Each structure stands twice: as structure tokens, then as C-alpha cells.
Design a protein around this nucleic acid. Structure first.
Lengths: 487, 489
DNA sequence: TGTCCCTCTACCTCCCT
DNA sequence: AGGGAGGTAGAGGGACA
DNA sequence: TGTCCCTCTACCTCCCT
DNA sequence: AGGGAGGTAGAGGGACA
């Protein structure tokens, strides 16, 4: 038992012993933990399983896995056992919040720092607990929290930022570095022919952090003069994680991609202005000719695919799957492009390849309906949810397949479907809506909160007729309903 | 013999000729041009009168009077005939926009500068033509336009203002001075005194902005330490035309008013926080004991606490007795009429029109008082006199409905718009007269009606999911702003 | 003087909830 | 509907050709 | 090498026109 | 209907130890 067994041997032994309660974990979940937490975390999960799952902690297996699967995972598991009770009982944090803080590399450090600093940050006229939890819920959360403590005063007093803007900058991986760099570079960047303070805060708040701010300082003059970009365009490229990489790649590839009958600067900016913009741009360079020759695409289509986050993944997946999808599944290049042209296009394409037969045969949808569901951000999520909920929505709530498809065919389709499942009964039976009206409300981006907002208004109102509320919900969803409140 | 006699005689001669076609100007119009544009303006109107009135320009006589009635009016008249076509074709401006630009001292300079700078302001600076027209449409518009061109970058970048805030500052007489002063004083007022950029923009965003900004810098310390005013109260006093005068008068009279009459600092600040705040404060000091020896202190404060405070106080002193005696009003009613911007105008108009509205139109004194008891009450009262017969006889409204439309700020505008749009909303789109009256019976009645007519006349996609009844409920709830927000969906 | 620009006061209308 | 904001008219001073 | 921190990439949902 | 904004999970690697 106690022994000098090798690393894999130790891992597999623990795996053997984790087949059952309270912590039943498959090799997959064990792989997830091990990639980051290592065999160390797996052994820690094994050692502490009963206390983690038992009272007063009451963590689900899902929460335990989430804490364990990070660098230092063993340390975070030990620390949550000690500090969760403390943070919840003495500071009124929820377990969800504590788990959120714990589930990042170095979670031990973040938890101990929230314990130490929450009392000083949340004094009168200070931060809310929610803001502290948000800052802490990233890798290096300890560093970000200590740096907010230090620099909140100078950033607000000397540089004129609001505490909310400071929290926004701090609430990213490498937040400490972003805060220190804003402090240093604000005066430099914000001069005539420079940036606005708003643009500096945006770059510092959007993921790209210190590196993006430093690269804009470095490259703004040459990008805006020799390369002819606007400061707005430069800020758009800078305002994602990896902004530095996209900026440098634009510098290098603008001369290459914008020659006669190539791309325009505006096309290049659109490709670069997403997370992974460097990868998207390099992949466009590599694959534009071959996608156009081999699969009959046009440059405009290639650019369209590339102009979303994960553009590299979508282009490579089009290269790989367009033939399979057209030949075996009967889709057209246009339909394949349509599915590919959203964030997560790779995920949607692979899910269409996998689920299209099942959806057309067993559930009776047409390929066109499947394409329609797939052709939105999170298309994979919406396709899988249609597969899951179509029969129950049609049988128990009496919807038609066409109505289910309409609910699903928008960004957040998964959320809207699940919310229709939840709320259709109360909306119809308690407030006299028809399923038609519920479907109409749900059949837009932001379908979920539109439904939630209308159920809430119909339950405890602050007028406007119910049909008028429904029309507003359809027109503008939750934001429409909230606009009416302020009237 | 007197030197100015030849010019005056020249003036009266040409003036007589302008009473004929194609302008048929009246006495008031002629005095106005002579007073503000001088003899060169009156002569210019005569010389250009044919070129301006018909094809191509087709300006109305009142438009010609608007352009002529400013220093350099002669210059502006010449420039408008020359540049109006160039600005309507080269930049897509309307004639009404060109006339608005021309209708200020130095309108020539503004027109020429709009011609020269509009492209660069809209292209390189991102401003819209509407924003350029607004900046241009003040005395010294040329200076404001040039300064916006020169300073928009440094103000947005080095000072963190939005382009909208810069336009707001520029869109006042003396815009150039306000912009240059904001550039210099923004860091000082924010960092030394804790003001937000928003507050500084608000101080700068009035006529005499520069003066108010420099006075806040000078007096903020003294006012907040000695007198116990807060930065917010100082900003509030500063945030009007003549802000400087108001602030300096507050320093002088705060203690005097508080000791001798027992006002609080709160009441003093309220009196000071209008256009003419200086005059209001000084008048409260000399008149309060006179009024109260009678009215209560609290009533005097209420009257004083609106723009034109001095005028209303003085008018109440003069008319309080004759209105209560001859016209059977109470002191509380006279105070109510007086306690709005333009109180003096409303009081004098009540004195003139109460007997007429009562006898000729069958209104009650209470209805007359209700119409008068809003800002622009004079205008609403005069419009009721004019339009009550046509609204009732031609459009089927009851006197009660007409009084309801009239009894809000902008009542004149609402009444005229109802007269104008009632038939189209009812006959063409099937609104009931009661629905039209409901939309009109709020502040902003006019624009709410126009927004509603706009939708049902050229059906915009956004407003389509909303039925006429829903649109009516929205228009009544939040007027043009609500309708406009819906359009944005 | 004629013109341009700036400041102050009074008055009117619409907005924001 | 109550305080707040945004706008136009009118008049006078400084400045200067 | 485990722990911590930072940087970069990919994916999902909702908002705003 | 087509971007814009904001949120998350996950991979890789440097520093340190």
C-alpha cells in the first residue's frame, strides 16, 4: 500500500479504487485531472474523497474534479477543506463562489488571499464581495488581489479610473501585470496622436493585458502611419487575449496579404480582431489558395470563415471535412461555409458530420434544418440539445419540430431550448400565453433571459398589456423589457 | 445740426420701400433689423430683396429678417445667396440649416468656415454634419469650428473627453474660449478639487463657459471652506450662463440672506442656480421684506428659484394687488404663475388675457391659471386664445381637452402640432381623438406626436411588431425618447 | 463705422425617470 | 411630475480694420 | 518536478442595432 | 442579420525550487 510503486502504477491503482462511491470517476475524468493536477492530484482526490463529499463540505464529484484539475490541484483540495467553511460562514460567500476561486492554477494562494484581503477590500466604500470573488477567480488571483489593494488608490486618484474599471482590468489572467502596466503607460499612450484613456482601459481589460499594452505602445506609430491602420483598428486587434501576437502578425502579413488583388487592410483587421487572430491570419496565408482550388471556395468565403474566433480551427476543419460533408451527407460548399463561419465553427462542423444522420432519420429533420441549427455560435451545443429535447418538447409540451428548430436556430439555442422546457408550463397555464407566443419569444438570440424576464414581470409586476409585453420581448428581449422599466 | 440725421433719414426711406413687395415687412421687423444689423443691413435687404425671395433660394421674409438682424447682416445676406446652393449640393445641408448658420453675428465667417471645414471634420475627425451645423450655429461659430478641428484630438486623447462632450462644449457662444479653458483647467479642477470630467464639461457647456470655469477654480476653495457649500452646490451654481456672476454673487449674499432673512444655504443655491442667478439673489435681498410685510418668505424663495427670478419678483410686486383685486385671484395662484421660467411674461399675459379667455372662450379662472402655471405660460395662453375656436369647432375637441394639451411646458407647440396632425392620425391611421389628446398632454407632446406620425407614415421595421395601440401607450409613457428607443431594436 | 467675437440675462421647450 | 438639461433672443462690451 | 504565474488560443452566450 | 462584448475552459511554458 505505502510503497515505491512508479507513477503510472500508482495512478492506475487509485483509478481501480475510484470505480465506486462516493467518488466514482472514470479514466476520462482521471485523465482530465492528471493533465494538469498530475498523479499528485489524483492521489489527493483518492485520499480525501470522503471528507470532500461528506458534510459539512458536500462537494459534488463534478466540483471535486474541477478543483483537482489544475496545477497545484492537491494544494487547492487541501485548502478548500480548510477555508470553504470559513469563507462561507464568516464572510457569506456561497460554496459555488469558493469553488470558483479554488478552480484555477494556484487555487490555494487565491483562497488564502481572499481570506486575508476580503476584510480589507470590503470595508465601507470599498469593493463588493462579488468583485473580490471575480478578481480572485483567475490564475494568479492572489497576485491580482494584492495589486488591486496596492494600486486602487493611485489608479483612481492620479489616473481618474473608476473602481469598476480597475476591477475590470484586474479580472483577467495576469491581472497584476495589466494593472501595473496601465499605471505605467497611461500617460505615455494618452497624448495627441495616441490613444484615449477609454481605449487603454479596453485593451487592459480584454485579455491581452500587459503584452498587448506594451505592443501597442511599440507598434502604434508604424501600424498607423506606414501600415495605414486607424488607432481604432489597432485597438480592436489589441483587445483580445494574445493581442500582442495578432498585432505583430498584422505588422508582418499586411505587406504580404494586401498586394494587388489580395486582401484589403480591412479584411486583415477583421481576421486579426479575434482571439487567436495570429493563428487565423497565418492559416489564411497557408490555406486560401488550396481551399479555393481544391474545394471550390472563393477568397471572400475563406475570409468569412477566418473572421471568427478559432478561425484557424474552422479553416482546417473545412479543408478536412468539406469533401466528406458534400459527398456523404449531400451538403453544398455554401452550406459548409455557413456552418464554419461562427465561433466554434470546427465544433459545429464535426457535430453536423456526426449527428446529421441521426437527426434526419430518427427525429425526422431535413438536412436544411440541421444546417440552420448548426449555423450559429455554439452550433454544437444547439445540435446536441435538439437531439436530446426534441422528443420531450414535441410529446410533453406539444410543440412541432419546426418550432423546436426555430427555437434552436440562434446563438444560445441550447439555453433557449432548455428554458422553453422549464418555463412553457407556467407561461401558458399561469399567465395565459400560448405555446406559439412562448416560441416567438424564445426564437431570438437571448431567448433564455427574454423568457426569464417575462415570467418575472408576469409574476411580480411594477400599465402595459401582456400582449404588449410579449411583443416587446420578441422585439428586444430582456433589454427591451428593462428599457420599459426605466420609463 | 445733428450728424446722425442723414443716416437716420436714409434708414427711414429704404425702410418705407421694404414695406412693399416682395417682403412686406412690418414695423417690428424693420426696427429689429435696424437695431441689430444697422443701416447697412437695412440697405442690403433692399438691394438683395428680389434675389433672396423667389427662385432659386425662395427664402421667406422672416428668414431674410433672421439673417439680416445681426452685426454683419449685410455680409451674411451676400454670403447666403452665394453659398446656400454650394452647401446644399456639396455637403447635403438643407436651406433651413444654412439659414440657421447664417443667423448670428459674423454669419459670413461661419458659413465660409462650414464650407471649408465640414469635409475634414466629418472625414478625419468623425463628426456628423448635424454636429458641424450645431457648432457653427452660434456667434463666433468660425472660431469654435477651427478650435474643434485643432483640439478634438488632444481633448479626447490627453484629457479623456468624448467627441460628444467636445461638441457640447463647442456648441455655445464663446465655444473657442470654453474649449481652450477646459484643455488648461480640466486636470486642475479634477485633481485639485475632485470634480469629475462630467462636472467640468457641464460647467464648460454654457455661454460664458470660460468665465465660469476660471471662477470655479478661483472660488471653489473659499466657498466650500468658509460658507460650507459643497462642490456639488458650486458646480450647480456654475452650470448656467453667467455662472461666474452667480458664483461671485453667492459669495457676497449668502451670509446676508442667511442672517437677515433666515434662508438656508440650500435655498440660496437654488436661487443662484439659474440664468441670471446674480440678479435673482440681489433682488431677493432688496425685495423680500417688501413682499413679506403679505407673501411668506418661503413663497418669495420659490419665485426667485427660477430663471428670470428678478423679473418675476418685480412683476409680482407690481401686479399682486391688481390681480387679486380686479381679477379675483389669490396670492397662492399669483405665486404659482410666477414660479416658472418667464414668470413675468406669464403674469402679464394672465392680466391681459384672463378676462378674454373667461368671457370670450368660457374658460374658468382656474383653467387660465393652470395654463399659465408652466414654463412658457405666455405662449400657451396666447396659443389657446388663437386655436381654441378651430380646435373645438373644426376638430371636435372639447375646451377641457384643449386646456389639457395646453397645460404643460411646450403647450404652444403641442397645441399647434395637434391642430396640424390630428386629422392625419385620425382619418389615415385610425387613432381616436382621445388617443391624440393623450399623447399631446405631456411635456414633449409635439415631438411625441411627430414620432408617432413618422412611424405610421413611413413604417420603420423596428416599430412594426408594435400595434398602433402599443405605440400610443409608449408615446404616452415616454414620448419621442421611448419611441426612438424602440426604433433602436 | 462695420464686423467679428464673447458674456450675460431672460425666456421657451424637452428630457429623465 | 419634479428636478434637470438644452436651446434661442436680445443686448452690450472688447477688438480691430 | 510540482506549484505558481503569465500568456495565448478556442468556444459559448447575449447584446445592439 | 452581422459584429461587438463579455464570460469560460484549456494548453504551454518560464521561474523557482
Amino acid at each position: 500500500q505505502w510503497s515505491g510503486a512508479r507513477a503510472l502504477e500508482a495512478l492506475l491503482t487509485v483509478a481501480g479504487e475510484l470505480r465506486g462511491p462516493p467518488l466514482q470517476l472514470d479514466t476520462g475524468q482521471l485523465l482530465k485531472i492528471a493533465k494538469r493536477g498530475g498523479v499528485t492530484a489524483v492521489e489527493a482526490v483518492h485520499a480525501w474523497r470522503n471528507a470532500l463529499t461528506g458534510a459539512p463540505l458536500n462537494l459534488t464529484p463534478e466540483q471535486v474534479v474541477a478543483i483537482a484539475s489544475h496545477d497545484g490541484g492537491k494544494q487547492a483540495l487541501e485548502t478548500v477543506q480548510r477555508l470553504l467553511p470559513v469563507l462561507c460562514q464568516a464572510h457569506g460567500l456561497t460554496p459555488q463562489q469558493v469553488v470558483a476561486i479554488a478552480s484555477h492554477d494556484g487555487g490555494k494562494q487565491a483562497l488564502e488571499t481572499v481570506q486575508r484581503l476580503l476584510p480589507v477590500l470590503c470595508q465601507a466604500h470599498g469593493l463588493t464581495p462579488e468583485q473580490v470573488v471575480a478578481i480572485a477567480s483567475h490564475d494568479g488571483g492572489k497576485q491580482a488581489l494584492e495589486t488591486v489593494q496596492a494600486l486602487l488608490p493611485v489608479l483612481c486618484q492620479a489616473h481618474g479610473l473608476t473602481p469598476e474599471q480597475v476591477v475590470a482590468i484586474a479580472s483577467n489572467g495576469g491581472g497584476k501585470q495589466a494593472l501595473e502596466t496601465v499605471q505605467r503607460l497611461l500617460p505615455v499612450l494618452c497624448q495627441a496622436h495616441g490613444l484615449t484613456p477609454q481605449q487603454v482601459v479596453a485593451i487592459a481589460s480584454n485579455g491581452g493585458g500587459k503584452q498587448a499594452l506594451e505592443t501597442v505602445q511599440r507598434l502604434l506609430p508604424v501600424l498607423c502611419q506606414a501600415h495605414g491602420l486607424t488607432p481604432q483598428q489597432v485597438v480592436a486587434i489589441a483587445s483580445n487575449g494574445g493581442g500582442k501576437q495578432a498585432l505583430e502578425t498584422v505588422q508582418r502579413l499586411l505587406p504580404v496579404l494586401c498586394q494587388a488583388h489580395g486582401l484589403t487592410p480591412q479584411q486583415v483587421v477583421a481576421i486579426a480582431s479575434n482571439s487567436g487572430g495570429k493563428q487565423a491570419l497565418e492559416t489564411v496565408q497557408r490555406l486560401l489558395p488550396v481551399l479555393c482550388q481544391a474545394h471550390g471556395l472563393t477568397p471572400q468565403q475563406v475570409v468569412a470563415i477566418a473572421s471568427n474566433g478559432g478561425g484557424k480551427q474552422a479553416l482546417e476543419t473545412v479543408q478536412r471535412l468539406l469533401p466528406v460533408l458534400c459527398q456523404a451527407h449531400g451538403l453544398t460548399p455554401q452550406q459548409v461555409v455557413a456552418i464554419a463561419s461562427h465561433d466554434g465553427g470546427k465544433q459545429a462542423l464535426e457535430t453536423v458530420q456526426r449527428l446529421l444522420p441521426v437527426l434526419c432519420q430518427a427525429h425526422g429533420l431535413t438536412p436544411e434544418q440541421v444546417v440552420a441549427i448548426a449555423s450559429n455560435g455554439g452550433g454544437k451545443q444547439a445540435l446536441e440539445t435538439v437531439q436530446r429535447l426534441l422528443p420531450v418538447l414535441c410529446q410533453a409540451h406539444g410543440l412541432t419540430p419546426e418550432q423546436v428548430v426555430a427555437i434552436a436556430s440562434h446563438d444560445g439555442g441550447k439555453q433557449a431550448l432548455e428554458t422553453v422546457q422549464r418555463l412553457l408550463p407556467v407561461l401558458c397555464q399561469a399567465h395565459g400565453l400560448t405555446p406559439q407566443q412562448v416560441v416567438a419569444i424564445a426564437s431570438n438570440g437571448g431567448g433564455r433571459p427574454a423568457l426569464e424576464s417575462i415570467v418575472a414581470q408576469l409574476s411580480r409586476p411594477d400599465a402595459l398589456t401582456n400582449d404588449h409585453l410579449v411583443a416587446l420581448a420578441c422585439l428586444g428581449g430582456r433589454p427591451a423589457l428593462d428599457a420599459v422599466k426605466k420609463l
